[PDB]
């Protein structure tokens, strides 16, 4: 499927070239096209997911949320399959395990002759990996499948605190605050953030109000709030529209004026960028982008500015690949961008599910909180239709969406909800109405030694250099992780008992996919890849984008914040190339 | 194995008949033959476990602990098989499940013609079952494989606090107190309790010392103590001799005079007790013991007194079956014993394994507690010998054997140890030195409705009336169990992190095998089956023994306390028929 | 467990010393004590199971088959727990697998600092292993759990046909047959082979006759027979008594003349045989035998003749360990016995279980063969007692015990039975009355390269050199294995459909425990260790016992044949040491 956007023309240079049709990549697209810039966007995957909008006879819009389709609203459990089908794992270490019970006549690996597994990475030490780190390919990137939770990152009162989630945009605290407030407001409106979309679910209120009551009668008080979600409940309240790249790009299809300033080539790989020259430590510039059409031909695409917004892993993979101008575990040296792939950070996650205390069904039948006439009605109604239901919760009552915002007191991010990305077999003997998920995300200190590198002699499925992780938690990273488990166990048991198979546990490293710091951006030029406008040092026309630009160790979901950097970088591009 | 001993003569009535050769029944055999009484005992199982002592020229002694064979002293992880191989589940409920992948030509169950499978129990409602409750059949009862923990029960300083572990034997606090002091001291000499057999284990001291340090300095203090065990470390400290029936029955085999007053019938089913009459409300006598030889032939056995020490399940069985002189799901009425099998109790259990924090390995290499030369010495030798090993604990170092004494403020029993009865897959990759178990056993309130009954028309593999359980906890039982769960999680996470697979979980009801109150003995005549000497109401020559005489809701392990009731009962016997 | 038998003299030269109290070891002790020789037996394990046989007043006999207890007869399923608890794996290879969901704070293996685990053998190539090869320690050895099948090994009509199961004991055709004939008859009596103990099973007759019927109609005909079992049905037909060491040793406990020439040292390790000298290829002799009492210490033990009957592993172990008189993957060289642990052979095994055809319950309700009125009556009584039962077969009916004897045109051993040793989760949804096990066993050719060797630097749990396997079957063994699997599928599907979970598969190499050839004996002196009398080359008081003696590639269960060898051997100790 091939979008009939503006057709590529050669040697009439674009204003902005953009790699990646993720929500971040889309943000550059919307804002630059808003500024009457002419934009060419490439995307390695396909246009896989559509919605329609009237022109200003209807216009397909790609990058829609696959969870939006009605079969996934009627049957949420089925959706984990789309996710598993979307995700491609970055680094799978090789192995040579012996199958003892093979028919002795069949082909078999030996000690000195293991199989040669295509795609698996011979350089990956399995002990320093992010084994569950993975990527999605397609218009909209990971946004056609995401959870849609968009908190702000935490800013401590002391601007010089030992730790912060929200990175510094300036050395002036009054000014730092100022920009972030503006960036945050805008990103929220871009992506469709709301905290009221579940204010009429019985489960959501049950879990939220009770936790608040419980934790005011405590030594340490904890504050429970609605997880900020990028979504809006639809006029039929059985349904929700989850937001994705579609609402960002919307007007680039829907507005004939803007539609002419925007090109999107799907199934196109940005292989690398070619520079004016290849000398470290002195001013430089992107000459063109090596784009390859993957449909079963090679293009040099010119533009006045360039954005790599291919997700945290791939963005670095392009800039790494670009170091090759046109023993066996050797990596590609990136001296043109020394800080590339250093200080990488990824969140430990703990997980469990509980079954609500039967005590709380009483609550459901007779809630002590006021202005709950809707709840009492839905309940009273349900028990009409189903006199013999153990659970008085209405059949299609939405899941809880509760969070606890980070504090330096409890330096981790908590989600109390139901996620579409189940981690095991659906518990078939327990009703879904009484299951609650807990996911606690920790943060990790940025250190130089923690690296994402790229192999010279190893290529992934798309002919790009193989990513290799070298990640080891720090000692205070581990103390915090432990405190986080404890916190989860305590908190969850306040309202339920662990649902068997979903007991307290750490998930495989990288599972959260909040990998950050791969092309990191901030005020310290020496240790970053880019400045606070996400411009790459020594390159006038080259910008990065995505979670890889985040220079801090943070616990919350990164997208909203990466959109802030997209706004900021887009404005620098606009102010330089208008 | 027909034990070479004083062969059965049916022309000299015995002083004592005992059914059951457990540790509780053998407590009778030992005390009674000590007092020149002449004793006949039948065991329905076989004599399979032996050690050999010199006569007071080597006499084989039965009821020796299976864990004492060197094979198991050197490979403890193998002993779980012995345990599983000796456990015989009591009530397996019927099922008729569709197997959709049968070759369609093979014998199959259908909806209306379900399989009839020998042994399972059509009366059991699975939701009130004690699914894991089971029995061992053989000389020693369960003692040939038990884990050997022998704590005392808790008595609140208030002799009238609303709940107590230790049952009352008098209404005077001081007399009651004094009786128990005496009973416990003998029992521990009979069973060979000792809290010092692990005092030179690194793993044991690490857990104990660090746990106490942590909680000496915490908001709510908790004291950790050596778990009292019925065993002793031999003089090659790698070996422990676990104690069982053999140490109790010992004299009766080795003293040529005690030889002659003791008859032991193995593979003999005490089918029932015949009375002189079967009217309820008035006095009565055990006429004789109806007893069968099960290997290739029925034997009335007359004696002056009769003791049923047949475990908590089989003891109620024999009595129930004795209500028969010599709607499909109707039970056997017990009018001669009005409260039999009523008021039963079992303990809720939670469980998890952790791996020790790696910072504690630093502690092992360099312990913060003064004057622990022997610890530094063992550690030094190992690091000398296995310089490479990431664990500084020596190879054959003993497990931890730590407890927390029940308190009314924390109404459950903990064990922080390593148990031979492992609960699932034996961890392939994790080193066993750094693994620690947690078991928390709660208590349940004795309630009338909580029953144990027997079927008229359903017979187990030994032709005895089929047990059926009708057990439901109470709301307060439940509330405590949640707190017990919360508490196991908080405690374990202080020194280690959950081993995947052994995360916080409740076990199947009855796995403790601490079933109790099937033949309850106490002061209130109208609610008990026996008195404080464990003579059945209205039968002057009939005594009960084992965990089922215990009338309280308790959380600690029961064997030691039951031995206390055995002694008290053996005195009441002797001071009658002596 | 020290036995009552004849004292230990450190002055007297015993006539014969024996290592190992398995069936082979017990056979030497019988035939030799019979011929008036004083014999010392040392066993490394304890005395686990006993029975009582009156003296020529009950005497305990060690070596009782553990399945004879009424427990494992009223519930055969439970017995695999005993088998698993008994087996100790010979060679377990090391590994360093990454646990990816460990709490990050806990102790962990790493890439270059893995766990050091007691009992893993670092020299083992997992690809050339017999990973299921295991030993059993105790009096009776493996005979206290064995399946008791005792077929004869195949002798082909030609005497120089390329392959035979049965080893050559002469170059004279007529004489070979004669010796084996009387050896077999003698052996059959010692252990007690009977092909008639299942002649009144409904299940056994159904399978036997139907298969024979069906296969009389087929293109290549195959003959089915009762599997020859070392057992006898007890006078009660529900119970069966499996034979074991106890019936080889009975005389030596039940005759004072006998008992007075038999010393039994359980828990005693025969560490090595010390020799006169150590010159390779020159007549030698044992001097003494080194023995360790493993109880809470060395012991020199003196006799004229010495028998090693420790298994096929532990036997060849013992001899190699003797090569040490009184890089680090290096192994103990055996220059005195060049062929020790070479030409080793083990049997591939295929397995499956079927559920019987529903069409066969009609054959059961109405069987078409002459003289089956006993069958009809049982079916009538069952159907009368159990109306609603789809299974006309009665509740206690013995399992099948059917074989097809090895032939040259189908060169594998086949068993169509029910084995106590289950291979995975017992299915709880299918009735065991219609389940049938299939175990085919192939044979591997002896090649010199196929080795069992012993580590100079790694010990097992009993301080003996770690055993190490170097085994790879040849292009012929593989091809035969293929036809064997095919033959099994074809044959099994004639009467039922594969039970789910128990579909056709190969089992882990070694699982059959018919390892042989470690100490091979024959008429080529160079390619053997001992001769046809089991007398080790160049040693005049040195004999070997067990499956290790068998020099050929065989597919049948080997104990009977080895028992033959233990007779031919036991005679040659008597005609030399008369
Ligand atoms: C199941 C799931 C749930 C999630 N839930 C949340 C959440 O609740 N909150 C949150 O903040 N985040 C969440 N995330 C993560 C979130 O989606 C990412 O932070 C976000 O998608 C990043 O946007 P991006 O455009 O920078 O990168 P991406 O979304 O990865 O998009 C990059 C695009 O570039 C394309 N590309 C890659 N390489 C090339 C190349 N060489 N040439 C051309 N194109 C290329 C890829 O195909 C992809 O389409 C979730 C992710 C997943 C998978
Ligand atoms: C693995 C395991 C670990 C344990 N660990 C502990 C622990 O650490 N601490 C603790 O306090 N408890 C523990 N227990 C429980 C403990 O073993 C029992 O409480 C104890 O053995 C009770 O002894 P008893 O004589 O009352 O009953 P039993 O030991 O069960 O003895 C009953 C005997 O009676 C025989 N019998 C039954 N019916 C008949 C019949 N009608 N005719 C003839 N004979 C009959 C049976 O064969 C059996 O031999 C453990 C149990 C197990 C299984
Ligand atoms: C579950 C099972 C089922 C089987 N079924 C069959 C079957 O149906 N048919 C068949 O033919 N075979 C069967 N076998 C194999 C059969 O058990 C053996 O072939 C048989 O026991 C051979 O006995 P052995 O005495 O030669 O060796 P073992 O029985 O292994 O006995 C050797 C003894 O030597 C002792 N020993 C070893 N080292 C030392 C040491 N140095 N010091 C002192 N003592 C030592 C060991 O403790 C052992 O007890 C089965 C085996 C198993 C495990
Ligand atoms: O794996 C699920 C988790 O993945 C993360 O990427 C999301 O940000 C969370 F919201 C989500 O719960
Ligand atoms: O399941 C094991 C448990 O069994 C129980 O019977 C014992 O009392 C516990 F101590 C033991 O840990
Ligand atoms: O594994 C079970 C098998 O063990 C083998 O050692 C026996 O010889 C077979 F008969 C038996 O079926």
| DSSP state string for C65-81 | -GGGSGGGGS-GGGHHH
- Please tell me the distance from the alpha carbon of residue B93 to that of residue B111, in angstroms, as a whole number: 17
* Residue owning tokens 């590198």: A453
Per the rule left: phi > 0, alpha: psi between -120 and 50, beta: everything else, B237 is alpha
Name the experimental technique.
X-ray
b/e map C376-411, b = 16+ CB within 10 Å:
eebbeebeeeeeebbbbbbeebbbbbbbbbbeeebb
Find chain C residues with C-beta within 8 A of B2's C-beta. Answer: 52, 58
**Which 8-state DSSP code applies to residue A93?**
B
Residue ranges of E strands in C63-217: 88-89, 134-135, 193-194
* Residue owning tokens 């193998």: B78
- Please tell me the distance from the alpha carbon of residue A136 to that of residue A145, in angstroms, as a whole number: 9
Q: Are the beta carbons of C485 and A103 separated by less than 8 Å? A: yes
The set of long-range contacts for A27-30, using a CB threshold of 8 Å and a minimum separation of 24, is A27/A190, A27/A248, A27/A545, A27/A563, A27/A566, A27/A567, A27/A570, A28/A307, A28/A309, A28/A545, A28/A566, A28/A569, A28/A570, A28/A573, A29/A248, A29/A249, A29/A252, A29/A262, A30/A190, A30/A248, A30/A249, A30/A251, A30/A252
A374 Cβ contact partners less than 8 Å away, ≥ 6 residues apart? A200
Q: Are the beta carbons of C500 and B99 separated by less than 8 Å? A: yes
C448 Cβ contact partners less than 8 Å away, ≥ 6 residues apart? C342, C343, C527
Q: In 10 A of CB C234, how many CB atoms? A: 15
Q: What is the DSSP string of C397-457?
A: -PPPEEEE---SSS-SEEEEE--SS--S---SSS-GGGEEEEEEE------TT-EEEEEEE
CB-side neighbour CA atoms (13 Å) of B325? 8
- Please tell me the distance from the alpha carbon of residue A15 to that of residue A41, in angstroms, as a whole number: 11
Q: Record the tokens describing residue C133, joined without a space.
A: 């090869």
- Please tell me the distance from the alpha carbon of residue C387 to that of residue C381, in angstroms, as a whole number: 10
- The DSSP H or E segment spanning A548 is none
Whether A415 has a binding-site annotation, put simply, is yes
Q: Record the tokens describing residue A465, joined without a space.
A: 């250099």
3-state secondary structure A360-399: HHHHHHCCCCCCCHHHHHHHHHHHHHCCCCCCCCCCCCCC
What separation in angstroms does the CA of A401 have from each of A151, A184, A358, A419?
A: 12, 21, 20, 9
Q: Which of B485, B504, B507 to mutate to test the interface with A (most CBs of A within 10 A)?
A: B504
Nearest CA to B383 out of B364, B360, B400, B368 is that of B364
Q: Are the beta carbons of B390 and C109 separated by less than 8 Å? A: yes
SS3 B274: strand
Burial class of residue C280 in the structure, from the number of CB atoms within 10 Å of its CB (0-12 exposed, 13-18 middle, 19+ buried): exposed
Query: Of all atoms in ligand 3, which is nearest to the CA of residue C566?
Result: 26
User: Is C16:C39 a contact under the CB 8 Å cutoff?
Assistant: yes
Q: Record the tokens describing residue A421, joined without a space.
A: 């990305």
Q: Are the beta carbons of B107 and C462 separated by less than 8 Å? A: no
What separation in angstroms does the CA of C266 have from each of B237, C3, C9, C83, C273?
A: 21, 8, 16, 20, 18
User: Is B240:B417 a contact under the CB 8 Å cutoff?
Assistant: no
User: Is C46:B71 a contact under the CB 8 Å cutoff?
Assistant: yes
Intra-chain end-to-end CA distance of chain B, in Å: 32
Question: A217 in contact with C at a CB cutoff of 8 Å?
Answer: no
Q: Give C425→chain B minimum CA distance, Å.
A: 13
User: Is B299:B270 a contact under the CB 8 Å cutoff?
Assistant: no
SS3 A434: helix
- The DSSP H or E segment spanning A137 is none
Alpha carbon B166 to its chain's center: 17
- Please tell me the distance from the alpha carbon of residue C457 to that of residue C455, in angstroms, as a whole number: 5
Q: Which residues make beta-bridge pairs with C50?
A: C62
The set of long-range contacts for A331-335, using a CB threshold of 8 Å and a minimum separation of 24, is A331/A123, A331/A453, A331/A454, A331/A455, A331/A456, A331/A468, A332/A453, A332/A454, A332/A455, A332/A456, A332/A465, A335/A280
Q: What is the DSSP string of A481-509?
A: HHHHHHHHHHHHTTTEEEPTT--SEEPPT
Q: Are the beta carbons of B107 and C434 separated by less than 8 Å? A: yes
What is the Cα Rg of chain A in Å?
25
Find chain A residues with C-beta within 8 A of C479's C-beta. Answer: 105
- Please tell me the distance from the alpha carbon of residue C554 to that of residue B43, in angstroms, as a whole number: 45
Q: Record the tokens describing residue B211, joined without a space.
A: 């746990």
- Please tell me the distance from the alpha carbon of residue A57 to that of residue A41, in angstroms, as a whole number: 25
Q: In 10 A of CB C373, how many CB atoms? A: 9
Q: What is the DSSP string of A262-293?
A: EEEETTEEEEEEEES---TTS-B-EEEEEEEE
The set of long-range contacts for C535-539, using a CB threshold of 8 Å and a minimum separation of 24, is C535/C569, C535/C572, C536/C337, C537/C337, C538/C281, C538/C282, C538/C283, C538/C284, C538/C336, C539/C275, C539/C283, C539/C284, C539/C285, C539/C286
User: Is B139:B19 a contact under the CB 8 Å cutoff?
Assistant: no
Whether B65 has a binding-site annotation, put simply, is no
Task: For chain C, give the longest Cα–Cα distance.
Answer: 78
Phi, psi of A480 (to 5 degrees): -65, -45
User: Is C219:C226 a contact under the CB 8 Å cutoff?
Assistant: no
- Please tell me the distance from the alpha carbon of residue C571 to that of residue A376, in angstroms, as a whole number: 94
B466 Cβ contact partners less than 8 Å away, ≥ 6 residues apart? B91, B121, B123, B454, B455, B458, B459, B460
Nearest CA to A28 out of A516, A504, A577, A526 is that of A577
Q: Give the pocket of ligand 4 (CB within 6 Å).
A: A 147, 149, 415, 419, 421, 439, 511-514, 557
SS3 B61: strand
Q: In 10 A of CB A496, how many CB atoms? A: 21
Q: Which residue of A has its CA nearest to C507?
A: A101
Ligand 3 neighbourhood includes C318 CB (under 6 angstroms): yes
Phi, psi of A142 (to 5 degrees): -70, -10
- Please tell me the distance from the alpha carbon of residue A351 to that of residue A505, in angstroms, as a whole number: 5
User: B288 alpha carbon to ligand 1 midpoint, in Å?
Assistant: 82
Resolution of the experimental model, in Å, one decimal: 2.4
What is the Cα Rg of chain C in Å?
25
Q: Record the tokens describing residue A146, joined without a space.
A: 């995401």
Q: Which residues make beta-bridge pairs with A465?
A: A459
Q: Beta strand pairing status for B465-470 and A496-498?
A: unpaired
Alpha carbon B214 to its chain's center: 32
SS3 A205: helix
Nearest CA to C309 out of C515, C21, C534 is that of C21
User: Is A207:A416 a contact under the CB 8 Å cutoff?
Assistant: yes
Intra-chain end-to-end CA distance of chain C, in Å: 32
- Please tell me the distance from the alpha carbon of residue B289 to that of residue B304, in angstroms, as a whole number: 11
- The DSSP H or E segment spanning B105 is none
User: Is C474:C335 a contact under the CB 8 Å cutoff?
Assistant: no
Q: In 10 A of CB C522, how many CB atoms? A: 18
Ligand 3 neighbourhood includes C27 CB (under 6 angstroms): no
Burial class of residue B285 in the structure, from the number of CB atoms within 10 Å of its CB (0-12 exposed, 13-18 middle, 19+ buried): middle
Question: B111 in contact with C at a CB cutoff of 8 Å?
Answer: no
Ligand 2 neighbourhood includes B558 CB (under 6 angstroms): yes
Phi, psi of B447 (to 5 degrees): -130, 140
Geometric angle at alpha carbon B396, from B394 and B400, rounded to 5°:
90
Residue ranges of E strands in A128-177: 134-135
Number of continuous H segments (helices) and E segments (strands) in chain C: 12, 24
Q: Beta strand pairing status for B542-544 and B303-308?
A: parallel
User: Is A240:A197 a contact under the CB 8 Å cutoff?
Assistant: yes
Residues of C designated catalytic:
514, 557
A196 Cβ contact partners less than 8 Å away, ≥ 6 residues apart? A226
- Please tell me the distance from the alpha carbon of residue C353 to that of residue C356, in angstroms, as a whole number: 10
User: Is B3:B62 a contact under the CB 8 Å cutoff?
Assistant: yes
- Please tell me the distance from the alpha carbon of residue C117 to that of residue C100, in angstroms, as a whole number: 19
- Please tell me the distance from the alpha carbon of residue B547 to that of residue A414, in angstroms, as a whole number: 46
Q: Record the tokens describing residue C312, joined without a space.
A: 């096929």
Q: Beta strand pairing status for A229-233 and A225-226?
A: unpaired
User: C142 alpha carbon to ligand 3 midpoint, in Å?
Assistant: 4
Q: Beta strand pairing status for B14-19 and B193-194?
A: unpaired
CA-nearest residue, atom 48 of ligand 3: C141
- The DSSP H or E segment spanning A308 is strand A303-308
Residue ranges of E strands in B55-189: 58-62, 88-89, 134-135
* C-alpha torsion angle, residues B497, B499, B504, B505 (rounded to 10): -170
Q: Record the tokens describing residue A71, joined without a space.
A: 């079969």
**Which 8-state DSSP code applies to residue B398?**
P
Question: C473 in contact with A at a CB cutoff of 8 Å?
Answer: yes
User: Is A558:A550 a contact under the CB 8 Å cutoff?
Assistant: yes
Backbone interruptions in chain B following residues (C to N > 2.5 Å): 56, 296, 326
Q: Record the tokens describing residue C188, joined without a space.
A: 């059959």
- Please tell me the distance from the alpha carbon of residue C561 to that of residue C149, in angstroms, as a whole number: 12
Q: Record the tokens describing residue A213, joined without a space.
A: 């009551």
Chains with at least 3 CB pairs less than 8 angstroms from chain C = A, B
Q: Where are the alpha helices (DSSP H) in A403-502?
A: 475-492
Q: Are the beta carbons of B95 and C428 separated by less than 8 Å? A: yes
User: Is A503:B489 a contact under the CB 8 Å cutoff?
Assistant: no
Q: In 10 A of CB A532, how many CB atoms? A: 20
Q: Which residue of B has its CA nearest to A483?
A: B493
User: C384 alpha carbon to ligand 6 midpoint, in Å?
Assistant: 37
Look at the alpha carbons of A228, A229, A235, A237 in this order and tell me if their dihedral is positive or negative. Answer: negative
- Please tell me the distance from the alpha carbon of residue B162 to that of residue B443, in angstroms, as a whole number: 14
Q: Which residues make beta-bridge pairs with A274?
A: A288
User: A413 alpha carbon to ligand 4 midpoint, in Å?
Assistant: 11
Burial class of residue A457 in the structure, from the number of CB atoms within 10 Å of its CB (0-12 exposed, 13-18 middle, 19+ buried): middle
- The DSSP H or E segment spanning A231 is strand A229-233
Q: In 10 A of CB A562, how many CB atoms? A: 24
What separation in angstroms does the CA of B390 have from each of A573, B357, C98, C110?
A: 54, 13, 15, 9
- Please tell me the distance from the alpha carbon of residue C286 to that of residue B509, in angstroms, as a whole number: 60
- Please tell me the distance from the alpha carbon of residue C240 to that of residue C194, in angstroms, as a whole number: 12
Q: Record the tokens describing residue A427, joined without a space.
A: 């518990």
CA-nearest residue, atom 11 of ligand 5: B147
- The DSSP H or E segment spanning B132 is none
B30 Cβ contact partners less than 8 Å away, ≥ 6 residues apart? B190, B248, B249, B251, B252
Q: Record the tokens describing residue B119, joined without a space.
A: 């042994």
What separation in angstroms does the CA of A86 have from each of A83, A140, A141, C60, C376?
A: 5, 12, 9, 70, 63
């Amino acid at each position: 499927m091939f979008l009939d956007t503006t057709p590529f023309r050669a040697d009439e240079p674009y204003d902005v070239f953009i790699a990646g049709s993720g929500p971040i990549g889309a943000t550059f697209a919307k804002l630059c096209v808003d500024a009457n810039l002419r934009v060419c966007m490439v995307e390695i995957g396909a246009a896989d997911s559509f919605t329609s909008k009237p022109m200003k006879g209807q216009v397909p819009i790609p990058g829609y949320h696959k969870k939006n389709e009605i079969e996934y609203q009627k049957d949420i459990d089925r959706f984990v399959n789309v996710i598993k089908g979307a995700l491609s794992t970055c680094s799978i270490p090789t192995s040579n395990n012996h199958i003892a019970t093979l028919d002795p006549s069949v082909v078999s690996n030996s000690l000195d002759k293991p199989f040669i597994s295509l795609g698996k990475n011979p350089a990956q030490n399995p002990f320093v990996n992010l084994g569950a780190e993975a990527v999605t390919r397609g218009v909209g990137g990971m946004s056609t499948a995401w959870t849609c939770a968009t908190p702000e990152f935490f800013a401590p009162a002391d601007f010089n605190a030992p730790h912060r989630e929200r990175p510094k945009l300036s050395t002036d605290a009054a000014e730092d605050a100022r920009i972030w407030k503006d960036l945050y407001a805008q990103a929220k409106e871009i992506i469709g953030t709301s905290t009221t979309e579940f204010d009429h679910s019985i489960r959501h209120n049950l879990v939220l109000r009770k936790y608040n009551d419980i934790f005011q009668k405590e030594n340490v008080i904890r504050e429970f709030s609605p997880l900020p979600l990028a979504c809006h409940r639809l006029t039929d309240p059985d349904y929700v529209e989850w937001h994705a790249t579609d609402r960002i790009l919307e007007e680039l299809f829907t507005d004939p004026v803007k539609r002419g300033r925007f090109t999107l080539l799907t199934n196109h790989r940005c292989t690398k960028l070619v520079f004016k020259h290849y000398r470290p430590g002195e001013e430089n510039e992107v000459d063109y982008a090596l784009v390859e059409d993957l449909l079963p031909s090679v293009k040099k695409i010119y533009a006045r500015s360039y954005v790599v917004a291919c997700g945290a892993v791939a963005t670095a993979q392009v800039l790494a690949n670009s170091h090759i101008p046109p023993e066996r575990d050797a990596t590609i040296p990136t001296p043109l961008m020394p800080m590339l792939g250093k200080y990488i950070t990824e969140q430990p996650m703990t997980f469990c599910q509980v079954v609500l205390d039967s005590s709380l069904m009483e609550v459901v039948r007779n809630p002590p909180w006021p202005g709950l006439d809707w709840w009492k009605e839905k309940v009273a109604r349900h028990v009409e239709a189903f006199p013999n239901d153990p659970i008085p919760i209405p059949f299609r009552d939405p899941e809880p969406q509760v969070t606890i915002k980070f504090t330096e007191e409890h330096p981790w991010h908590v989600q109390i909800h139901r996620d579409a990305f189940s981690y095991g077999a659906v518990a078939e003997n327990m009703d879904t109405r009484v299951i609650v998920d807990y996911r606690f995300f920790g943060y990790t200190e940025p250190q130089e030694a923690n690296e994402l590198v790229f192999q010279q002699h190893y290529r992934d499925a798309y002919d790009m250099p193989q990513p290799t992780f070298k990640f080891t938690m720090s000692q205070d990273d581990r103390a915090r992780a432990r405190r986080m488990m404890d916190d989860m166990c305590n908190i969850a048991l306040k309202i339920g008992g662990y649902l068997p198979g979903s007991e307290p546990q750490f998930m495989t490293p990288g599972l959260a996919l909040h990998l950050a710091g791969t092309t990191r951006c901030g005020l310290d030029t020496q240790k970053t890849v880019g400045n606070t406008h996400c411009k790459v040092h020594n390159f006038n026309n080259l910008y990065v984008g995505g979670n890889g630009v985040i220079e801090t160790g943070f616990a919350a979901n990164p997208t909203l914040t990466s959109i802030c950097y997209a706004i900021r970088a887009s404005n620098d591009i606009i102010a330089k190339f208008g």
